[PDB]
Amino acid sequence: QKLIANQFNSAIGKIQDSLSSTPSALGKLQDVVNHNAQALNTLVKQLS
Amino acid sequence: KNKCVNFNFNGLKGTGVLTESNKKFLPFQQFGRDIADTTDAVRDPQTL
């Protein structure tokens, strides 16, 4: 039991630290926003 | 100033609100455009 508890806690800590240290993990969501923003910008440029 | 007026500056027609500007473009510069490529800042002919 306690070995499994230690492994679980260590795994959670590793997930937290790795998620903090890697910036490209959350690209997908970020990508979404970029698309919309870029699209809107393009439309504005069409007025010129 | 400071109301919805139809303005005509040197044949440039438009409708909007004219406010005192804190922009500091150089004396030779006359007009001011924006991201959408339209004039948003102007310099009066009679009084600079």
What are the tokens at B18? 């004219």
Phi then psi for residue B12, to 5 deg, are -85, 110
- What is the experimental resolution, given in Å to one decimal place? 3.5
Please count the other Cβ atoms lying within 10 Å of the Cβ belonging to residue B14: 14
Label each residue of B20-37 as H, E or C.
CCCCCCCCCCCCECCCCC
Tokens read off for A43: 């439309």
Please give the Cα distance from B37 to A45 (Å, whole number).
8
- What are the chain A neighbours of B39 within 8 Å (beta carbons)? none
Which residues 1-30 of chain A have a CB within 8 Å of chain B? none
A48: nearest Cα among B40, B13, B15, B38: B38
Instruction: Answer whether B10's CB lies under 8 Å from B22's CB.
Output: no
Q: How is residue A23 written in tokens? A: 């910036």
Method: cryo-EM
